[PDB]
mmCIF file of the N, C-alpha and C atoms, coordinates in Angstrom:
data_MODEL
# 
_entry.id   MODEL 
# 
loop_
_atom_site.group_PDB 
_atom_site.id 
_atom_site.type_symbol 
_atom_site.label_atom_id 
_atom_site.label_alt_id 
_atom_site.label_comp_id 
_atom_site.label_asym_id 
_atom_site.label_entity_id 
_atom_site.label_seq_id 
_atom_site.pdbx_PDB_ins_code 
_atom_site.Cartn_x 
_atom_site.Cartn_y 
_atom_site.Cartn_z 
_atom_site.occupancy 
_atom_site.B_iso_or_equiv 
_atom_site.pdbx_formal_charge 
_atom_site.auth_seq_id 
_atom_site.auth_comp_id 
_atom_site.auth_asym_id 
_atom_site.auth_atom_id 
_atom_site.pdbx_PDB_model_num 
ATOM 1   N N  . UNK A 1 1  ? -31.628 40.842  -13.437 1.00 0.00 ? 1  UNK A N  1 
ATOM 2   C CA . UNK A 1 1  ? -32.239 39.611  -12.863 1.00 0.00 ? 1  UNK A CA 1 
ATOM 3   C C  . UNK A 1 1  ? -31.355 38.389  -13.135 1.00 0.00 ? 1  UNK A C  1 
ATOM 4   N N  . UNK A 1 2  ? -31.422 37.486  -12.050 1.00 0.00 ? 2  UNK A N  1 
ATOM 5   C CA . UNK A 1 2  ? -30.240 36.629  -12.364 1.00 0.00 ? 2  UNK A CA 1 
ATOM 6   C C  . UNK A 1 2  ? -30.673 35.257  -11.506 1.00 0.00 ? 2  UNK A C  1 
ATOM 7   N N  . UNK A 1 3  ? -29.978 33.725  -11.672 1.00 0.00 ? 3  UNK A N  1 
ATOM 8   C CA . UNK A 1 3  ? -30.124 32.987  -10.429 1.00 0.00 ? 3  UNK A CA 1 
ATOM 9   C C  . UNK A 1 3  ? -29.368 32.962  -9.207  1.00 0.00 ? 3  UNK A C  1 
ATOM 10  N N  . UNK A 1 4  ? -29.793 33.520  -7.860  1.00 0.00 ? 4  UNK A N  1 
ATOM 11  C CA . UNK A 1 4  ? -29.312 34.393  -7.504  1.00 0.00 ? 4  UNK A CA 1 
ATOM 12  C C  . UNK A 1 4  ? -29.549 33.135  -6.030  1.00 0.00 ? 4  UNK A C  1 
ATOM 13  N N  . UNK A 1 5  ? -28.655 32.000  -5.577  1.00 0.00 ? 5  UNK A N  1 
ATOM 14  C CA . UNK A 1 5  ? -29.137 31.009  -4.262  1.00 0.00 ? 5  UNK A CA 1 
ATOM 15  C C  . UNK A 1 5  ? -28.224 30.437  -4.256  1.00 0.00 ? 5  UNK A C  1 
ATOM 16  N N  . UNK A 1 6  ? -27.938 30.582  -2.567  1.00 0.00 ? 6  UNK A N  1 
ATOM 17  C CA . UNK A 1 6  ? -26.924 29.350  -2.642  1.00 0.00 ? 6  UNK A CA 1 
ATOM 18  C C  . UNK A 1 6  ? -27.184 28.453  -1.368  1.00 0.00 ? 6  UNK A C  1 
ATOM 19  N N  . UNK A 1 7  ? -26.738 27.083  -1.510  1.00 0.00 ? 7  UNK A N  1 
ATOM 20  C CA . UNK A 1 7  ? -26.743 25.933  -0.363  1.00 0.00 ? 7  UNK A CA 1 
ATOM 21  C C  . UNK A 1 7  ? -25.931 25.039  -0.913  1.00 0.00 ? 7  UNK A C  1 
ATOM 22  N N  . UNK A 1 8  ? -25.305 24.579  0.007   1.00 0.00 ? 8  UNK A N  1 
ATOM 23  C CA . UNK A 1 8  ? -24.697 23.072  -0.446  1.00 0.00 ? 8  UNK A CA 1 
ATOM 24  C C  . UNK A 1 8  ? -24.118 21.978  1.103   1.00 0.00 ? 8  UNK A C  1 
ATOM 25  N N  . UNK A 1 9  ? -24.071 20.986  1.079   1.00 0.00 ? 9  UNK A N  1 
ATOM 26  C CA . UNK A 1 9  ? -23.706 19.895  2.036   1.00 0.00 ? 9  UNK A CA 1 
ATOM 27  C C  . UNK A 1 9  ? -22.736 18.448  1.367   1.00 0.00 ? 9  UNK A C  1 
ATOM 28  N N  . UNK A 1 10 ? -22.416 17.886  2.370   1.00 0.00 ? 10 UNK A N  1 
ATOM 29  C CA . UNK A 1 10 ? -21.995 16.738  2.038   1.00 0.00 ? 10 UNK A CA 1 
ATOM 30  C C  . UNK A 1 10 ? -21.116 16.352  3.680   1.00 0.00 ? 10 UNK A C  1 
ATOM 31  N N  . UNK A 1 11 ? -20.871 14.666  3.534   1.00 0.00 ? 11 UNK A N  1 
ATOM 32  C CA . UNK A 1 11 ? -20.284 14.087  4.628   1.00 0.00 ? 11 UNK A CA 1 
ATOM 33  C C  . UNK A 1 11 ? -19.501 12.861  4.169   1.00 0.00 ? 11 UNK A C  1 
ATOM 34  N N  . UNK A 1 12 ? -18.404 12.239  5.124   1.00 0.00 ? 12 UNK A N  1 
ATOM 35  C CA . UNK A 1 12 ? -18.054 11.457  4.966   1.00 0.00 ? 12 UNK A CA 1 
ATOM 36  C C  . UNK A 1 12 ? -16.915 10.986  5.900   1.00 0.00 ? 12 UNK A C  1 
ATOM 37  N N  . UNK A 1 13 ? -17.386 9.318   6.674   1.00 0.00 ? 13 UNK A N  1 
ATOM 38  C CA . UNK A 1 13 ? -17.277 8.819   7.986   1.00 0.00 ? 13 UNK A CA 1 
ATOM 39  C C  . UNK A 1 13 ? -16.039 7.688   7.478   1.00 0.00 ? 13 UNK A C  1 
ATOM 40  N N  . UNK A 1 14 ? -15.159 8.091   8.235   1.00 0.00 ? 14 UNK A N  1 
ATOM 41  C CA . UNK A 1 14 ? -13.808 6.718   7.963   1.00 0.00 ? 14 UNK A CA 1 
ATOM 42  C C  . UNK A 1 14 ? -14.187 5.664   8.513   1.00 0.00 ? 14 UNK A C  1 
ATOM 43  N N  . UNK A 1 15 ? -14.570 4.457   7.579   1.00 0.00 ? 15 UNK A N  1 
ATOM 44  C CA . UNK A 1 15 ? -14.876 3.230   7.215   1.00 0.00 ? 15 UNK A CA 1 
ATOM 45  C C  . UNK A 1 15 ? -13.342 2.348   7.652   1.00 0.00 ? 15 UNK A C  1 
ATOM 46  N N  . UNK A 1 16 ? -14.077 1.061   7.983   1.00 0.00 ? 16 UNK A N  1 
ATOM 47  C CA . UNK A 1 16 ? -13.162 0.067   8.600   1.00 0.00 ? 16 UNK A CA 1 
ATOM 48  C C  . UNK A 1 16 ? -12.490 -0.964  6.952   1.00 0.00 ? 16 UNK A C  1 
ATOM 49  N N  . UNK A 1 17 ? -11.617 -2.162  7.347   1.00 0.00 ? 17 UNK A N  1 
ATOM 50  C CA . UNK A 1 17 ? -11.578 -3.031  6.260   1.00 0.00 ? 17 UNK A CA 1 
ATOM 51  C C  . UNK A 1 17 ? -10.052 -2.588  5.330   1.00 0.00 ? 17 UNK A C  1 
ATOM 52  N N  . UNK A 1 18 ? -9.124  -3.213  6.023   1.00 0.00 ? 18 UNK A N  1 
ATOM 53  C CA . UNK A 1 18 ? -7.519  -2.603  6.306   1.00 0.00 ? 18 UNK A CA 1 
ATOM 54  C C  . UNK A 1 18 ? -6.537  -2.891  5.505   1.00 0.00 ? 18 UNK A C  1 
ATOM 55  N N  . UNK A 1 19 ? -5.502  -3.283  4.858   1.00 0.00 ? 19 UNK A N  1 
ATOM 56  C CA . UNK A 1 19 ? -3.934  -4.128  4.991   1.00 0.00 ? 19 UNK A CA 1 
ATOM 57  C C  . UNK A 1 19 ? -3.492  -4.021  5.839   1.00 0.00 ? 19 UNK A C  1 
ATOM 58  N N  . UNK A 1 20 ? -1.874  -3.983  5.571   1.00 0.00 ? 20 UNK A N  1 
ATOM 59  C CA . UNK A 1 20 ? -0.672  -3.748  6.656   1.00 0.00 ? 20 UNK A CA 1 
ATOM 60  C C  . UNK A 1 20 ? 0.031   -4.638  6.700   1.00 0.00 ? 20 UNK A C  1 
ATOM 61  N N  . UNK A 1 21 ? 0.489   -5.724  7.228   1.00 0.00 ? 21 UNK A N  1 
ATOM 62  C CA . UNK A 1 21 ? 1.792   -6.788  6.627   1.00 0.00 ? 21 UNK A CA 1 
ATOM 63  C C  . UNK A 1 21 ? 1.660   -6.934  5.380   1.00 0.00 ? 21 UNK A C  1 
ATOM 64  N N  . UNK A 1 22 ? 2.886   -7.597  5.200   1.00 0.00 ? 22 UNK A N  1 
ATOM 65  C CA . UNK A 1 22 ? 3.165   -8.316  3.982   1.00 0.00 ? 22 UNK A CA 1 
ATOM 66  C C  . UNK A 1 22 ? 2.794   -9.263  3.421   1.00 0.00 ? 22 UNK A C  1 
ATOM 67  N N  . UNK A 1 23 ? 2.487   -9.961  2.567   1.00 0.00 ? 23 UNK A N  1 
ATOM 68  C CA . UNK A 1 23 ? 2.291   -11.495 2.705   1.00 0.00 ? 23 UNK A CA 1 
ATOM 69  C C  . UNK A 1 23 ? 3.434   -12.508 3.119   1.00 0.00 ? 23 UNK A C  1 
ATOM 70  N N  . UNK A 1 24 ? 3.237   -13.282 3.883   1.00 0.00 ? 24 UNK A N  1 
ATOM 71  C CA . UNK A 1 24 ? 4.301   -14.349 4.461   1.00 0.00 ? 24 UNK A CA 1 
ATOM 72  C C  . UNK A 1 24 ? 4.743   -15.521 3.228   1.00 0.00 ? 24 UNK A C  1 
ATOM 73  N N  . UNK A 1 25 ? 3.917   -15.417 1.804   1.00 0.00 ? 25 UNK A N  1 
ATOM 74  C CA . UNK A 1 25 ? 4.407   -16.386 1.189   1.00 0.00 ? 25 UNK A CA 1 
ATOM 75  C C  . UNK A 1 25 ? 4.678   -15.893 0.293   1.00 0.00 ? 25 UNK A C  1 
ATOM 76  N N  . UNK A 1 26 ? 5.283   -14.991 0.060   1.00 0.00 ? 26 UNK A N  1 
ATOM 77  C CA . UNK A 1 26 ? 6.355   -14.060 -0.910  1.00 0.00 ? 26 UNK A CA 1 
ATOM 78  C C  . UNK A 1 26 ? 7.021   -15.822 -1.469  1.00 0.00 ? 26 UNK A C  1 
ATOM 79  N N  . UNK A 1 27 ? 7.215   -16.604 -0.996  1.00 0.00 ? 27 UNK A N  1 
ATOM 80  C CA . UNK A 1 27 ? 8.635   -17.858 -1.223  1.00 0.00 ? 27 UNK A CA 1 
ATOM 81  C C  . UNK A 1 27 ? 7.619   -18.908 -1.998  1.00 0.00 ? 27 UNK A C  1 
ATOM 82  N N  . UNK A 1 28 ? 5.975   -18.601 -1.546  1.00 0.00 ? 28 UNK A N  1 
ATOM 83  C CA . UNK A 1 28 ? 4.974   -19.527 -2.467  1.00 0.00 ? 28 UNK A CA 1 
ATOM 84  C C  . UNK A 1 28 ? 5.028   -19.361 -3.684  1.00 0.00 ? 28 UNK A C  1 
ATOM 85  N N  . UNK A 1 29 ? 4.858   -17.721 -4.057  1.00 0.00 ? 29 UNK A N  1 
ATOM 86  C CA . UNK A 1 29 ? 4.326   -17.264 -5.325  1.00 0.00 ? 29 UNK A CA 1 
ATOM 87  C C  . UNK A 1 29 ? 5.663   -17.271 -6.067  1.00 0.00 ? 29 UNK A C  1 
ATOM 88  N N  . UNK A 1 30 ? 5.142   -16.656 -7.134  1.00 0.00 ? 30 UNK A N  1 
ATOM 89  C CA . UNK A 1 30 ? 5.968   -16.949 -8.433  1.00 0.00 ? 30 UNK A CA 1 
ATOM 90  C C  . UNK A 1 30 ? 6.792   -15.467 -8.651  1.00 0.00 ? 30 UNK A C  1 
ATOM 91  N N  . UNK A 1 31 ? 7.919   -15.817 -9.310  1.00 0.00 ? 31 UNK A N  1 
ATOM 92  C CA . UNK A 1 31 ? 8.827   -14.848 -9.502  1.00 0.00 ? 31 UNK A CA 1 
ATOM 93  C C  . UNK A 1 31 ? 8.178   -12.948 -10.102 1.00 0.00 ? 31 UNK A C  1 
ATOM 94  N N  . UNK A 1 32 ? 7.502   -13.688 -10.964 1.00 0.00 ? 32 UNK A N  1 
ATOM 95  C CA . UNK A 1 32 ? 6.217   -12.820 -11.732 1.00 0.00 ? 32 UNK A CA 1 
ATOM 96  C C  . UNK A 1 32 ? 5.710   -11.803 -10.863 1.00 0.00 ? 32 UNK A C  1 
ATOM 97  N N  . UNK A 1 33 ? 5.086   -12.466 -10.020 1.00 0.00 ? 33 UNK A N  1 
ATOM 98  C CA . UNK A 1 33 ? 4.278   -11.891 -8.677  1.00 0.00 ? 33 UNK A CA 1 
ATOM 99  C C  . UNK A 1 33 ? 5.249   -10.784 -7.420  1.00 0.00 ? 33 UNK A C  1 
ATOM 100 N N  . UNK A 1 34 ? 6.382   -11.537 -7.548  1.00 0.00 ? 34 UNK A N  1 
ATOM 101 C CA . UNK A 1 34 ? 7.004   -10.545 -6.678  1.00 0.00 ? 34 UNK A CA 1 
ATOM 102 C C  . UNK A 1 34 ? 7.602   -9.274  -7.827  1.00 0.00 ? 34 UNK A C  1 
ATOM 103 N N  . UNK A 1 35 ? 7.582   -9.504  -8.631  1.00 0.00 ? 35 UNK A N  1 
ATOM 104 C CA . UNK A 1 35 ? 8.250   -8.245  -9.801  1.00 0.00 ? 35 UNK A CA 1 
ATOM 105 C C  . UNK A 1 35 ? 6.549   -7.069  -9.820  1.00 0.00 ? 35 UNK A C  1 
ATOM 106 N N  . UNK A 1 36 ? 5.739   -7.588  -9.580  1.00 0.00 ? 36 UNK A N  1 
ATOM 107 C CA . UNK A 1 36 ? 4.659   -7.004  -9.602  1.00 0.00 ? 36 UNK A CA 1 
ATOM 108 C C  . UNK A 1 36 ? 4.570   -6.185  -8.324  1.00 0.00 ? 36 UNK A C  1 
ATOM 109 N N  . UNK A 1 37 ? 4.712   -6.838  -7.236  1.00 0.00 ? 37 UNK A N  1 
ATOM 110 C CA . UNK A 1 37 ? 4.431   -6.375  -5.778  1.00 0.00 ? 37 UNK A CA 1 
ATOM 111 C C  . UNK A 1 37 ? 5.786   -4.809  -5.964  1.00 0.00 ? 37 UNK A C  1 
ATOM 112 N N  . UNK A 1 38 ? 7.125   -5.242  -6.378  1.00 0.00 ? 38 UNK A N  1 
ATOM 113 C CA . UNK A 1 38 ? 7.861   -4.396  -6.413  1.00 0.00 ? 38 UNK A CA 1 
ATOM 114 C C  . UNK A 1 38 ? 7.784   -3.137  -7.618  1.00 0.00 ? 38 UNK A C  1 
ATOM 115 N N  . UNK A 1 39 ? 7.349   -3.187  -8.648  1.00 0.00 ? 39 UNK A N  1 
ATOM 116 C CA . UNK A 1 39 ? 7.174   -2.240  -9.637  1.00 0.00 ? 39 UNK A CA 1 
ATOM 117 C C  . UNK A 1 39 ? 6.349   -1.749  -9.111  1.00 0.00 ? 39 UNK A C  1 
ATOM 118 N N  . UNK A 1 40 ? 4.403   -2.084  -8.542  1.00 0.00 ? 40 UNK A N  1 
ATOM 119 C CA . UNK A 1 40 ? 3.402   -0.962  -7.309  1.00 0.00 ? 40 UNK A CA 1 
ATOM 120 C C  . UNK A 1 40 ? 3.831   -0.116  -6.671  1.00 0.00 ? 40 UNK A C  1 
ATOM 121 N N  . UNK A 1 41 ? 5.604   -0.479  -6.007  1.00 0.00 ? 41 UNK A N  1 
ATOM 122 C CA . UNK A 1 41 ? 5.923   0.539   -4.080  1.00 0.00 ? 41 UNK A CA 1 
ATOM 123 C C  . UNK A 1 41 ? 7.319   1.197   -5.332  1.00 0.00 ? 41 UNK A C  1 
ATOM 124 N N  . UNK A 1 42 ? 7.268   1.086   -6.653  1.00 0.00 ? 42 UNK A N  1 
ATOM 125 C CA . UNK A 1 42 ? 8.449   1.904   -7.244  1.00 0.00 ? 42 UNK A CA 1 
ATOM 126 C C  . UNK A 1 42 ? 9.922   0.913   -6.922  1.00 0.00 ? 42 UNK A C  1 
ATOM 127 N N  . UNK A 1 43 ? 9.851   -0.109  -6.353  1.00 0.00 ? 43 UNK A N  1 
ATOM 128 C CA . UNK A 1 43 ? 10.916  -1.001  -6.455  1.00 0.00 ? 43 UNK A CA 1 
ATOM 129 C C  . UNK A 1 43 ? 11.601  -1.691  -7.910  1.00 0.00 ? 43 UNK A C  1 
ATOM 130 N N  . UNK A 1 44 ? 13.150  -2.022  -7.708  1.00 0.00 ? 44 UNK A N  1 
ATOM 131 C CA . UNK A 1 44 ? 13.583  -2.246  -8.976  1.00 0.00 ? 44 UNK A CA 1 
ATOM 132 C C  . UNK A 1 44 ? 13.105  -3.977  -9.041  1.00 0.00 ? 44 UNK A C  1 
ATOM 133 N N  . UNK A 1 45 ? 12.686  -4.582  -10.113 1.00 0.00 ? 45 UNK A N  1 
ATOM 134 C CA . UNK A 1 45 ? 12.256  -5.772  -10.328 1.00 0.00 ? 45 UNK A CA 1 
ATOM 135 C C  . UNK A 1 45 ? 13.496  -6.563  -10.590 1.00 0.00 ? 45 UNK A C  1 
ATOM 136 N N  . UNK A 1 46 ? 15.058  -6.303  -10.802 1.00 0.00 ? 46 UNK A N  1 
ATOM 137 C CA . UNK A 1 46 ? 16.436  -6.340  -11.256 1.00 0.00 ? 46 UNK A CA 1 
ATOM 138 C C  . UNK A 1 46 ? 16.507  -8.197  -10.652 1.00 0.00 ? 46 UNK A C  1 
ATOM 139 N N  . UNK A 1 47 ? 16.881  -8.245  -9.170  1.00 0.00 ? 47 UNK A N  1 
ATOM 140 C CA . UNK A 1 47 ? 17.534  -9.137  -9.067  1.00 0.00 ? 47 UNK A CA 1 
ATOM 141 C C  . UNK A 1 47 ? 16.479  -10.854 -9.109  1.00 0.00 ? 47 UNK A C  1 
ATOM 142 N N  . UNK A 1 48 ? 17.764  -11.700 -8.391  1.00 0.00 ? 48 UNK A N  1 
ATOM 143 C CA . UNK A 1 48 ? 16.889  -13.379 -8.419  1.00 0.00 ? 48 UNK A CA 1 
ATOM 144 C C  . UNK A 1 48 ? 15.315  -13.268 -7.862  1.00 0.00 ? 48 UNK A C  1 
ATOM 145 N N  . UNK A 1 49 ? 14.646  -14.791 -7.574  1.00 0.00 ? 49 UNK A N  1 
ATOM 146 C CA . UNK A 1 49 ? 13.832  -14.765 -6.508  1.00 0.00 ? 49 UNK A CA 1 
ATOM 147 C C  . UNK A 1 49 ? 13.633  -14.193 -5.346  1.00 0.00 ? 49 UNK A C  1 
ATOM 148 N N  . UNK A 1 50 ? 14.862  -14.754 -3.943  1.00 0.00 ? 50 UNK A N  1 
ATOM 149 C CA . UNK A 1 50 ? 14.634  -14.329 -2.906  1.00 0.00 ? 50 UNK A CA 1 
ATOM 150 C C  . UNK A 1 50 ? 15.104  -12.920 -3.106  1.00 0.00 ? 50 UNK A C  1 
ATOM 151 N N  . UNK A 1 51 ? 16.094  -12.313 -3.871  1.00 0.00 ? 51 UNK A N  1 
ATOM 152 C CA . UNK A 1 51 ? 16.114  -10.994 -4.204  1.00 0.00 ? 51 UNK A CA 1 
ATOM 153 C C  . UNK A 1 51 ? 15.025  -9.737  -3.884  1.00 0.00 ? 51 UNK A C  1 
ATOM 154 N N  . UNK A 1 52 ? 14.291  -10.300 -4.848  1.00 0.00 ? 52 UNK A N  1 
ATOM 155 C CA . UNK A 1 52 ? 13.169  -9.856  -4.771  1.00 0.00 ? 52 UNK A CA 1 
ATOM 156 C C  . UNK A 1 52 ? 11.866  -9.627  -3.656  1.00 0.00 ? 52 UNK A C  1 
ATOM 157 N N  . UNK A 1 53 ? 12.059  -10.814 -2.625  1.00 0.00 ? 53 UNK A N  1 
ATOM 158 C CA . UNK A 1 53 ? 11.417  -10.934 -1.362  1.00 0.00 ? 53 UNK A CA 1 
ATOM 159 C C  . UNK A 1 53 ? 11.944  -10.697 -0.285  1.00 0.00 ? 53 UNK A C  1 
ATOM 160 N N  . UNK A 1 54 ? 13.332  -10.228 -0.164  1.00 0.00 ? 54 UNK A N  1 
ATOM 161 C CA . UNK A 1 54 ? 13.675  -9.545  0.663   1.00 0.00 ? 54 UNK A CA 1 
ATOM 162 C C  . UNK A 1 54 ? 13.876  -8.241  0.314   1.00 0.00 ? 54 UNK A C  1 
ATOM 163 N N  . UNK A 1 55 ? 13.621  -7.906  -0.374  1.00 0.00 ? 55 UNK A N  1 
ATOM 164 C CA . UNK A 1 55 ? 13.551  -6.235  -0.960  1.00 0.00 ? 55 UNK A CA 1 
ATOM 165 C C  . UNK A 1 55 ? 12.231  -6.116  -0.993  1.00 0.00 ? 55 UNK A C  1 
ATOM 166 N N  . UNK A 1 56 ? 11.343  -6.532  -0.766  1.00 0.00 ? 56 UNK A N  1 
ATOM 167 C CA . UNK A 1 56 ? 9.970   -6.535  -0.165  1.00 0.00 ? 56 UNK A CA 1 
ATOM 168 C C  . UNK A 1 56 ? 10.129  -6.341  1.263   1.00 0.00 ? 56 UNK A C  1 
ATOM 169 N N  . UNK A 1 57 ? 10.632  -6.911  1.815   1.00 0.00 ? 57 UNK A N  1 
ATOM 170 C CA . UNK A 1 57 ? 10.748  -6.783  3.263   1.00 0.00 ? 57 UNK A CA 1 
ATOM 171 C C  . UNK A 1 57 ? 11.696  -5.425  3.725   1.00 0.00 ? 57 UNK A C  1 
ATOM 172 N N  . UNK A 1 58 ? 12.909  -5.236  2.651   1.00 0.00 ? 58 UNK A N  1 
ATOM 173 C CA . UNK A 1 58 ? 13.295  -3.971  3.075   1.00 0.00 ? 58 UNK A CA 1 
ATOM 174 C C  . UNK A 1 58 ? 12.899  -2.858  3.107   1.00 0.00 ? 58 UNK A C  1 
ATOM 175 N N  . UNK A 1 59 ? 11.736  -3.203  2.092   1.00 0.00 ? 59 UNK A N  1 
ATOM 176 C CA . UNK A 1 59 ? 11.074  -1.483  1.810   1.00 0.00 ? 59 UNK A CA 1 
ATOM 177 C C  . UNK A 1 59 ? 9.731   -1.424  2.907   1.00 0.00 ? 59 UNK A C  1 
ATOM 178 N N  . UNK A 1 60 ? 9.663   -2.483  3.549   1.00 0.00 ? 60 UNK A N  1 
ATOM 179 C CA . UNK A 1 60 ? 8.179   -2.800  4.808   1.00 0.00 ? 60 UNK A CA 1 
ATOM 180 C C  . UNK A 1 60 ? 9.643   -2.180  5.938   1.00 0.00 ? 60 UNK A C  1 
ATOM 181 N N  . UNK A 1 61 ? 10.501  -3.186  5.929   1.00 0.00 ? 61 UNK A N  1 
ATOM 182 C CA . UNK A 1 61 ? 11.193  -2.108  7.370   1.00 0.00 ? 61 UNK A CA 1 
ATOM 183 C C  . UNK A 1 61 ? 11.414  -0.689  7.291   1.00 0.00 ? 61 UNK A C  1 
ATOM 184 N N  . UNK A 1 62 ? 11.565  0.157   5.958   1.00 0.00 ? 62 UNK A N  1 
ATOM 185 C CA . UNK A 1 62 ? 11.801  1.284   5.832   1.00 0.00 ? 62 UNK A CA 1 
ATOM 186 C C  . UNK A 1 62 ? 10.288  2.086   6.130   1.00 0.00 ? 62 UNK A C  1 
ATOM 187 N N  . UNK A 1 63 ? 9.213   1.436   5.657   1.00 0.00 ? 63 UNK A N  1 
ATOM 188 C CA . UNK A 1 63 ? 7.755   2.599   5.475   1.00 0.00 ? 63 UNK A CA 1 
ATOM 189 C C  . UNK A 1 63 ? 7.165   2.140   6.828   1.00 0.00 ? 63 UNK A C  1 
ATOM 190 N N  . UNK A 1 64 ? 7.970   0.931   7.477   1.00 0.00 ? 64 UNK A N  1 
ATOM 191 C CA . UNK A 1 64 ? 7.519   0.800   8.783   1.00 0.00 ? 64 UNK A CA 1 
ATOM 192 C C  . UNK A 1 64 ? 7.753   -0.993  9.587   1.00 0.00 ? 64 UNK A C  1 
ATOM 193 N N  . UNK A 1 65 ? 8.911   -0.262  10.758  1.00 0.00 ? 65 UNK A N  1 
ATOM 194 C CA . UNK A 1 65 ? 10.254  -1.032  10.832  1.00 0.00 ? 65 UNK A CA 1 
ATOM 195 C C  . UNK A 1 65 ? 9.482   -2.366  12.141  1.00 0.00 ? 65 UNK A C  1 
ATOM 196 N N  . UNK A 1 66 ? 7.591   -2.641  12.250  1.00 0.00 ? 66 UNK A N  1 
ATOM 197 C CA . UNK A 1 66 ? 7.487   -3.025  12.910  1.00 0.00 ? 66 UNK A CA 1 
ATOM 198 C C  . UNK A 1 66 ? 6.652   -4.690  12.221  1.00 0.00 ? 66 UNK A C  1 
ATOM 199 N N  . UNK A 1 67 ? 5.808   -5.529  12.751  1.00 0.00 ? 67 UNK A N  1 
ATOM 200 C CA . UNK A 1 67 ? 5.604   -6.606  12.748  1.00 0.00 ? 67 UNK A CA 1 
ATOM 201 C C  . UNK A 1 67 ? 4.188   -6.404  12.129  1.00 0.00 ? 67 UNK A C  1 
ATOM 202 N N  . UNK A 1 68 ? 3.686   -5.040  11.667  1.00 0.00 ? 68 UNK A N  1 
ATOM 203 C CA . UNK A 1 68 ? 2.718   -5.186  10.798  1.00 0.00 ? 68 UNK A CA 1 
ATOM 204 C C  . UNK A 1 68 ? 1.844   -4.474  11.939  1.00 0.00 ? 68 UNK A C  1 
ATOM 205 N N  . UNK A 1 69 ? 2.112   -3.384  12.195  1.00 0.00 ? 69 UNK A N  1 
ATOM 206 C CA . UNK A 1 69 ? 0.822   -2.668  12.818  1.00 0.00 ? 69 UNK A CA 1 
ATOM 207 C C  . UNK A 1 69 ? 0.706   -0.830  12.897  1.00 0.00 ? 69 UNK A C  1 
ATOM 208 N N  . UNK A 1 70 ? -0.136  -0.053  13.417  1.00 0.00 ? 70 UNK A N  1 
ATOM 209 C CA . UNK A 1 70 ? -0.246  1.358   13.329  1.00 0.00 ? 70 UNK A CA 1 
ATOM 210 C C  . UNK A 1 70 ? 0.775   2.087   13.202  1.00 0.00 ? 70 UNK A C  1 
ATOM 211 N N  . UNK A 1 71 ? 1.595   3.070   12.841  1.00 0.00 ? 71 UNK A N  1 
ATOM 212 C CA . UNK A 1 71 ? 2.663   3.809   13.829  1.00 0.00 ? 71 UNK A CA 1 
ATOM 213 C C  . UNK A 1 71 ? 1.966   4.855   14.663  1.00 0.00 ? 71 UNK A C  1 
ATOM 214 N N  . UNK A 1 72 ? 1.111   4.918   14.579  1.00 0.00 ? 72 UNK A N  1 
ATOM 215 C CA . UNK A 1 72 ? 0.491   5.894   15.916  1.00 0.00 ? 72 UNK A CA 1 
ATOM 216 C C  . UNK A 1 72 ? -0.906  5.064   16.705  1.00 0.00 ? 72 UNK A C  1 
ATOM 217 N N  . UNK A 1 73 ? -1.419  5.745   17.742  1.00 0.00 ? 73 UNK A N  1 
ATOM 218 C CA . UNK A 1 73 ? -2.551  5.398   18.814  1.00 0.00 ? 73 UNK A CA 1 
ATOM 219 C C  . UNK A 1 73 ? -3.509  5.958   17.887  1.00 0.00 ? 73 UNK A C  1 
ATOM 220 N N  . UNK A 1 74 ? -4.414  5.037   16.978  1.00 0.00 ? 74 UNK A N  1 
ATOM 221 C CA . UNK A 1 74 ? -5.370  5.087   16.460  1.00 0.00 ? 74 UNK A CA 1 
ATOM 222 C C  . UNK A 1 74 ? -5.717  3.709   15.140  1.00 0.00 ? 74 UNK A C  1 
ATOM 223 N N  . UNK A 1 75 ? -7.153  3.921   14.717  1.00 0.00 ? 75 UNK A N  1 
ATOM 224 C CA . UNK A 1 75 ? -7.449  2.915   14.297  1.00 0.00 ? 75 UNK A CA 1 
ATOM 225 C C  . UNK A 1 75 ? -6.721  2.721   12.389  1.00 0.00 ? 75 UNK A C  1 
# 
């Protein structure tokens, strides 16, 4: 004699509420802030200021070489 039943369920619906560009004031914030943004994507934190914010931008043209939108037909 034993417990001897089985059932089980579950669901789950892809929800809206996005990123995708960059921020445009990489040149506002503080040096700090961009060493942060770059250590998150595995970037080296090494060089100056703009250093740093255009190596933000190089690694957005590399994971995706466009103006901040899908790479495929969907949401």
């Amino acid at each position: 004699m034993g417990h001897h039943h089985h059932h089980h369920s579950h669901m789950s619906t892809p929800l809206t509420g996005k990123p995708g560009a960059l921020p445009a004031n990489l040149d506002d914030m503080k040096v700090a802030e961009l060493k942060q943004e770059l250590k998150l994507r595995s970037l080296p934190v090494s060089g100056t200021k703009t250093e740093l914010i255009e190596r933000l931008r190089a690694y957005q043209d590399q994971i995706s070489p466009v103006p901040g939108a899908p790479k495929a037909p969907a949401a």
